[PDB]
Structure formats: C-alpha cells, structure tokens
Amino acid sequence: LLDAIEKAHPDVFNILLQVLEDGRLTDSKGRTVDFRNTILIMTSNVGASEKDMKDKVMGELKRAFRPEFINRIDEIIVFHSLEK
Amino acid sequence: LLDAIEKAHPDVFNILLQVLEDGRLTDSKGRTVDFRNTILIMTSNVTQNHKDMKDKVMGELKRAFRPEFINRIDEIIVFHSLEK
Numbered sequence: 211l212l213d214a215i216e217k218a219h220p221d222v223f224n225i226l227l228q229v230l231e232d233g234r235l236t237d238s239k240g241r242t243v244d245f246r247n248t249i250l251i252m253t254s255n256v257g258a259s260e261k262d263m264k265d266k267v268m269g270e271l272k273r274a275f276r277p278e279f280i281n282r283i284d285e286i287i288v289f290h291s292l293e294k
Numbered sequence: 295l296l297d298a299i300e301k302a303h304p305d306v307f308n309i310l311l312q313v314l315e316d317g318r319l320t321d322s323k324g325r326t327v328d329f330r331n332t333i334l335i336m337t338s339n340v341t342q343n344h345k346d347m348k349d350k351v352m353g354e355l356k357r358a359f360r361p362e363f364i365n366r367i368d369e370i371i372v373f374h375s376l377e378k
Contacts, residue, residue, distance in 0.1 A: 214362075217308045255362060 216254035220264070221293050223279050230282035257288065296336045304359050314366030336367075344374045 215223070229235060233246035256274050257267030267288050271280060280286075299307075313319050317330040351372060356364070362372050364370070 213312070214308075258361065 212252045214254055215252045216256050220275055223275060224227075227279050227282055263290065296334075298338065299336045300338045300340045300358070307359055307363055311363055311366065314363075344372075348372045 212220070215226075225235065229245050233244065235243045235245065235249075237243065242249070256270050257263065259270075265285065268286070271286070296302075296310075305370055309319075313329045314334070316330055320326045338355075340351060340356055352370065355370065
C-alpha cells in the first residue's frame with residue numbers, strides 16, 4: 211500500500227514502473243526481489259477538485275506524471291464522493 | 295509542539311500527515327515510532343467580531359494548505375484577542 215503517491219518526487223516513480231511492468235526490483239546487494247505475488251495499491255487524491263468526473267480526473271492524471279507510469283496499471287479507479 | 299506552522303514549507307506537513315492520520319512515523323533505518331500516545335499541538339497566526347475573524351481565518355487556512363491535512367486534525371481552535 212503506497213499511500214499518497216501524488217506527494218513524492220516525480221522521480222521516485224521510476225522504481226515503481228520497473229516494478230509494475232515486470233514485477234521485480236534489484237537492491238544494491240543484487241538480490242532481484244520478486245513482486246509477482248503482491249496485490250499492489252496506490253492511493254492518491256489528485257482529482258480533489260472534482261462520469262465526466264472520470265474524464266477530468268484522467269486529464270489531471272495525464273498532467274500529473276509520465277504516460278509511461280500510467281501505462282503500467284491494471285485499474286485506474288476514481289472514487290466518487292459520498293452522499294447522505 | 296510545532297511553532298509558527300505558517301512559515302514551514304508544506305512538505306513538512308506532508309510529513310506530519312501520516313502522523314495525524316495513523317499515529318506512526320517511520321524514519322530511515324525503518325524504525326516505526328508510535329505517535330499513538332502523544333498530544334500534538336500546532337501554532338500559527340494566519341463580540342461577533344470574533345466570529346467574523348473566526349470564519350475569516352478558517353478561510354485563510356483552507357487557502358493555506360491542502361484539505362487532506364485539515365481532515366486529520368481534531369480541533370482547529372481560534373484564540374480570541376486578549377481583552378482589557
């Protein structure tokens with residue numbers, strides 16, 4: 211569970227993209243750790259402003275960070291606000 | 295006790311965000327320290343005149359930093375001017 215990816219230096223996402231496409235990291239020692247059995251989640255409220263909601267949020271995402279990062283993703287999920 | 299939070303750069307607040315939300319900080323080396331049992335106080339300076347000033351500085355606060363931060367805090371206390 212990577213909380214609030216929105217607020218991390220846009221450079222820190224590149225490790226994540228290495229992870230998402232293939233499912234592995236390599237630490238300095240060299241042990242290629244295997245992420246391929248791990249349900250992975252990222253929770254960033256970027257459309258905080260506001261089905262058109264999906265459209266605007268996707269726009270703010272495309273602007274938020276690289277298309278390469280977005281392409282490795284299973285389901286972009288836009289949580290809708292709450293009601294009475 | 296954090297003093298004069300109006301001056302700190304918001305990244306410090308994005309640090310405290312996890313503290314307020316879940317009561318735990320993890321520093322480098324991975325030591326997870328529990329803020330679960332700490333009373334946390336922040337400062338700032340950002341009849342019904344007191345009420346008007348109250349809503350005024352509430353608005354200035356909402357404009358100050360993100361809403362996801364304000365959701366964490368139990369009380370936003372406004373201190374009325376000292377009277378003679």
